Structures are given as structure tokens and as C-alpha cells.
Amino acid sequence: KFSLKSTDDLNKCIDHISVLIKDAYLLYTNESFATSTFISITIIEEVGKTHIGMFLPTIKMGGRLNKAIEMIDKIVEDAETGELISIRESSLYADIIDDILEVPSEKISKEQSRALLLYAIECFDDSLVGYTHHSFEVSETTDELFEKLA
Amino acid sequence: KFSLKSTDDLNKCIDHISVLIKDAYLLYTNESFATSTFISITIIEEVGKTHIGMFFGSLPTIKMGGRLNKAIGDEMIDKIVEDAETGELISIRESSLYADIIDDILEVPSEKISKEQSRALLLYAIECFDDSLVGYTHHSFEVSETTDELFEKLAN
Ligand SMILES: [Br-]
Ligand SMILES: [Br-]
Ligand code: NA
């Protein structure tokens, strides 16, 4: 379906994912933890679609993602499971779970939002930063926003 | 599938729709027109699910002097209405968040959704909420005061 033919195509997807990261960050800051989280899980599946379009990033362990959030194992497990899909659903859409009404603001925690954005940014960084001059420019904003969330 | 059995359920949904409106406005007001629009279209779909839930369906009834009529004009209302009837609003929603290869040229949200489109869809979504759900519960009127303000700001 989706295959990138050019270094310009990769820079377009880089740029777009920078927008989602700025929007996920903007939402987290304004305490919209559930909507932020929805955009955070989108980035991780969009980063994965881009990497595959050119033809998961193994935790550093001791690296800035550990020192900032342990909880990594959790997100990686939910990601492998297919559980991150249902967490994303529940982070934007209200739902009758069996016969109680469930709502985004009471399914996503401030720290869950913080962790998936920090994880999304690493997803993008480990996957795409390094393959163009442009990625390096972008990574310094990605870095500034990452550091600010710690 | 989705039904609501109490005014507590309705108000919780109403509150959630208030969150999405604030979020679409937050994004728009930054300059993330595309992500905004994804939320604005979601709001229109989740107002319908909710209205129907208590019984793109519930489109606002347009009146000649109406605040929306005033903020975006007759042409545009008609356009959004047609996009909702034919399901163009779903493709617009997909294109406002997800990169795509169409014909064989990479498409990105920033190049599909204009400021003008983003503004009109949030105003429109806000008027969906208001027409469909405000009046049902005493709490809805409280939330309408917030949504009314966001509406006033966006239309000037
Ligand atoms: Br470059
Ligand atoms: Br009352
Ligand atoms: Na009404």
C-alpha cells in the first residue's frame, strides 16, 4: 500500500510526525491527557508505517526514556498484544463497557499520557532521525520537547 | 449497541464533547488546522452517536440569521452539509490526520486542510452539539455557556 520513493517523501512524513508530536505535547500541557494520548499512539503507528514505507525501538536501558519514566515494558507489551489499539479507542470515544458508560477522561492518567508521548518521541527518533540532514534539525525540537517533559 | 439509560450518562457524554471542542479549538488556535479538523469531524460523529444513543445523523437545522450562517455564510454550510450527506466528511477526517499515497504522490494533512476549512468545521461541530444536545439537561445549559464563548471567539 504505502511506499516512499524519495528523501523528500521521508522529510514530508518526518514534518507531519513533528506536527502530531507538537499537538500531543500542546494537549498534555493543557491537561487533555486522553486526547494527547490518542495523538501519541497515532504517532507510534505512523512512525512504524513510515519506517516500513522506506523498506519498535529496543529500549536503551539506562537511556533518557528509562531516567524519565520500567513502565517501558508495559507500553511495549500493550503494543505487541494489540492492547494499544483499544487504549487509543478509549482515549477519544465514549463506550458502554458491558453495561457501564466509560469516557476518555477517566481511562487515561496524566502519567500514562506523559509516558506514551515520551515513548512516541523515542519511536520517531530511533526510527527516522539520522537518515537526512532535515531529521537532525527536527530532532533538536523533538529533544527540547522530550527534556521539557522530565 | 450504544444506548444511554440516565441523565448521568448523557451529561458525561456532553462533558466529553466539551473536551473535544476545547481540544479542537486549542489546536486551531495554535495553527494545527488539520489535527483540529480531525477532532471537529469526530465531535460531529460523537454528537450523533449520543443523540441517537438516548433513543453524521443529527445535522444542525440552519436558520437565515443564525450565528453559524453569520460566521461562515450559506455557501460552506451547504458544502459541509453535502460532505456529511455523501460521506466526503469521512475522507476529509482520514486526510486530516494520516499521510497517504494518492495516484502516486505522497499526501500530508498540512496540505489538505485549510484554515478556512478548519474554522468552519469547528464552528459547525459546535453548532451540532448545541442544536442536538443543549436543552436536554440542566447541566447542558452550563456547558453551552463555555461552548458559546469558544464559538464567539472563533467567529471574529
Ligand atoms: Br535533507
Ligand atoms: Br433541574
Ligand atoms: Na438545542
Chain B touched by A34 (CB under 8 Å): yes
Ligand positioned closest to the Cα atom of B134: 3
Interatomic CA distance for residues A121 and A127, integer angstroms: 10
Provide the grid cell at A116: 506514551
Q: Tell me if residue B101 falls in helix, strand or coil.
A: strand
Rg of chain B, C-alpha, whole Å = 15
Tell me the CA–centroid distance for residue B125 and ligand 3, in Å.
13
Kindly report the number of other CB atoms within 10 A of residue A70's CB atom.
9
CB contacts, 8 Å: B98 with chain A? 42, 46
Would strands A95-97 and A100-102 be described as parallel, antiparallel, or unpaired? antiparallel
B101 phi and psi, to 5 degrees? -105, 115
CB contacts, 8 Å: A92 with chain B? 20, 42
Chain B touched by A42 (CB under 8 Å): yes
Q: Helices marked H in A82-132 — which ranges? A: 83-90, 110-128
Provide the grid cell at B80: 459541509
DSSP code string of B104-132: TEEE-GGGT--HHHHHHHHHHHHHHHHHH
Tell me the CA–centroid distance for residue B57 and ligand 2, in Å.
28
Q: Can you say whether residue B135 is alpha, beta or left, with left for phi > 0 and alpha for psi between -120 and 50 degrees? A: left
B108:A12 CB<8 A: yes
Q: Tell me if residue B3 falls in helix, strand or coil.
A: coil
Interatomic CA distance for residues A23 and A30, integer angstroms: 11
Rg of chain A, C-alpha, whole Å = 16
C-beta contacts of B66-71 below 8 A and 24+ residues apart: B66/B127, B67/B127, B67/B151, B67/B155, B68/B123, B68/B124, B68/B127, B70/B155, B71/B120, B71/B123, B71/B151, B71/B154, B71/B155
Ligand positioned closest to the Cα atom of B147: 3
Interatomic CA distance for residues A77 and B53, integer angstroms: 34
Kindly report the number of other CB atoms within 10 A of residue B5's CB atom.
12
Nearest-CA neighbor of A47 among A16, A85, A75? Answer: A16
Half-sphere exposure of B71 (CA within 13 A, CB side): 23
Tell me the CA–centroid distance for residue B50 and ligand 2, in Å.
20
A3: closest chain B residue by CA? B101
B97 phi and psi, to 5 degrees? -130, -30
A126 phi and psi, to 5 degrees? -65, -35
Residue with cell 494537549: A27
Q: Tell me if residue B155 falls in helix, strand or coil.
A: coil
| Segment (H or E) for B81 | helix B74-86
β-bridge mates for residue B101, sequence order: B106
In chain A, domain spans: 7-148
Contact indicator for B96, B38 with CB cutoff of 8 Å: yes
Q: Is B141 exposed, middle or buried (0-12, 13-18, 19+ CB in 10 A)?
A: exposed
Interatomic CA distance for residues A37 and A33, integer angstroms: 6
Q: Tell me if residue A63 falls in helix, strand or coil.
A: coil
Interatomic CA distance for residues A10 and A132, integer angstroms: 9
Tell me the CA–centroid distance for residue B51 and ligand 1, in Å.
49
Residue of A6, A27, A95, A124 to mutate, interface with B, max B Cβ within 10 Å: A27
Interatomic CA distance for residues B119 and B24, integer angstroms: 10
B109: closest chain A residue by CA? A16
Taking every pair of Cα atoms in chain B, the longest distance, rounded to a whole number of angstroms, is 52
Strand blocks (E) in chain A? 95-97, 100-102
Chain A touched by B31 (CB under 8 Å): no
Contact indicator for A42, B109 with CB cutoff of 8 Å: no
Ligand positioned closest to the Cα atom of B141: 3
Chain B touched by A7 (CB under 8 Å): no
Helix B7-29 and helix B115-133, axial crossing angle in degrees, nearest 10:
160
Instruction: State the resolution, in angstroms.
Output: 2.5
Tell me the CA–centroid distance for residue B6 and ligand 2, in Å.
14
Measured in residues, chain B has a length of 156
Q: Is A78 exposed, middle or buried (0-12, 13-18, 19+ CB in 10 A)?
A: middle
